[PDB]
Amino acid sequence: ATGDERFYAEHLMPTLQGLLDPESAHRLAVRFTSLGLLPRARFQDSDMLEVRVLGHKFRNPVGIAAGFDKHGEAVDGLYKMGFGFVEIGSVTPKPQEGNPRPRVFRLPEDQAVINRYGFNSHGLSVVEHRLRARQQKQAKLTEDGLPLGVNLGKNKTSVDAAEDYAEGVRVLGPLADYLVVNVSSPNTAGLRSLQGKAELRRLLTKVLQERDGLRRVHRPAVLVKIAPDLTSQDKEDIASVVKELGIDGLIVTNTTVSRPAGLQGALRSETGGLSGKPLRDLSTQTIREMYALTQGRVPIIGVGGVSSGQDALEKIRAGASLVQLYTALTFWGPPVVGKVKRELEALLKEQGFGGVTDAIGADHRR
Ligand SMILES: Cc1cc2nc3c(=O)[nH]c(=O)nc-3n(C[C@H](O)[C@H](O)[C@H](O)COP(=O)(O)O)c2cc1C
Ligand SMILES: O=C(O)c1ccccc1N/N=C/c1ccc(-c2ccccc2Cl)o1
Ligand SMILES: CCCCCCCCCCC[N+](C)(C)[O-]
Ligand SMILES: O=C1C[C@@H](C(=O)O)NC(=O)N1
């Protein structure tokens, strides 16, 4: 625990970042993870951390966010890392390369990253076969409280966005415990305007119809993942459509195209989505707002700048049933997962909660 926590944070990771640019480090990390070349994950999840939501049991509330394992190559290594659930993607229907390099940038002074990957993806067919090869193993993992999510994107040249997502539902829906309709990527022109009302209702109506057409045992929950950069009108509209159509949950939030005042990193003006610490409270506030607009009736996965138990608990109290992290992993390495879980459990006891479930939305009941 604390030993290689400090070793990874003070020595290992800083040395990795000195040797490798962000995208190279990302690639290597995916390789190592898929091979199980990880530190020992000694933290044992207590019953306090268990959550039941989205039609599943989650043995702990800390997931790996979409974008790390884009093509489904490292899923088992990620469970080994200690994540209570794993989300792969975004996956696009056809293979595509994404934007030209460089397309990932570190802001060390801000504990932040900026990326404009642009949905680089092996495509549905490759990922489908990848997941099929471990399908029964995943079934046991899920039954064991370790669910799998799949994040669906759309091709850059795609003429019909709803049809791209419908394809993803048909191909990967049968292999996922939940699907994410990602209408919040900063890095595909036009995508985020799928977040407007009548266009979103049409989009999500088609997604849900395709989902309902799958056989029962293979029918995933469907979640919508939104940006932190929405107007009050956007959020209000999304909340309304989500409740009207019976969307199963929200993921809040993606990266931000904003650049908060105070960023110090030399690369702060690179185009792309900003993640990590500068995003943290913007994300938490968006969770707070969406939870209230949905009357606490729509499950929320909270994401954005989580690197400690306090960060996680603040999102849970704000209305998140589950949280994810990504950027924190790039700075502190695999030990950050056990760290977050251990601190979350301590804070829960400290504040008088019997478990995570009791803390969900607790700020709204004060
Ligand atoms: C390098 C990188 C790539 C990402 N790729 C995706 C993606 O493909 N699909 C998606 O829905 N979110 C993607 N994200 C967003 C993350 O899932 C997450 O919402 C965001 O980074 C905020 O969490 P964080 O501060 O813990 O990193 C990406 C983020 C980063 C840093
Ligand atoms: O480095 C970036 O700026 C970066 C940018 C974008 C995405 C990921 C990024 N780095 N990720 C590093 C990482 C992940 C996992 C491990 C790791 C470390 C040590 C042992 C085992 C493992 Cl799996 O290192
Ligand atoms: C199959 C068409 C080409 C898709 C390549 C997508 C990237 C695969 C490797 C992921 C890690 N990365 C390249 C982002 O550093
Ligand atoms: O959803 C996404 C897509 C990703 C990319 O550019 O591939 N970049 C992000 O920050 N969020």
Experimental method used, please? X-ray
Number of folded domains that form the chain: 1
How far apart, in whole angstroms, are the C-alpha atoms of residue 302 and residue 314?
10
What is the largest distance, in Å, between two alpha-carbon atoms of the chain? 53
CATH number of the domain where residue 331 is located: 3.20.20.70
Q: Which ligand is nearest to the CA of 279?
A: 1
Ligand 1 pocket test: which of 277, 326, 331 has the largest number of ligand atoms within 8 Å of its C-beta? Answer: 326
User: Where would I find the H helices in the chain?
Assistant: 2-7, 13-19, 22-35, 75-80, 124-132, 135-143, 161-172, 197-212, 232-245, 280-293, 309-318, 327-332, 335-350, 356-359
Q: How far is CA 224 from CA 164, 183, 242, 247, in A?
A: 15, 7, 8, 8
Give 52's contacts (C-beta < 8 A, 6+ positions apart): 58, 357
What sign has the CA pseudo-torsion 315, 320, 326, 330? positive
Range of the domain at 357: 1-366
Q: Which of 121, 185, 283, 321 is catalytic?
A: 185
Tell whether ligand 4 has an atom less than 6 A from the beta carbon of residue 273: yes
331: its two tokens: 């700075």
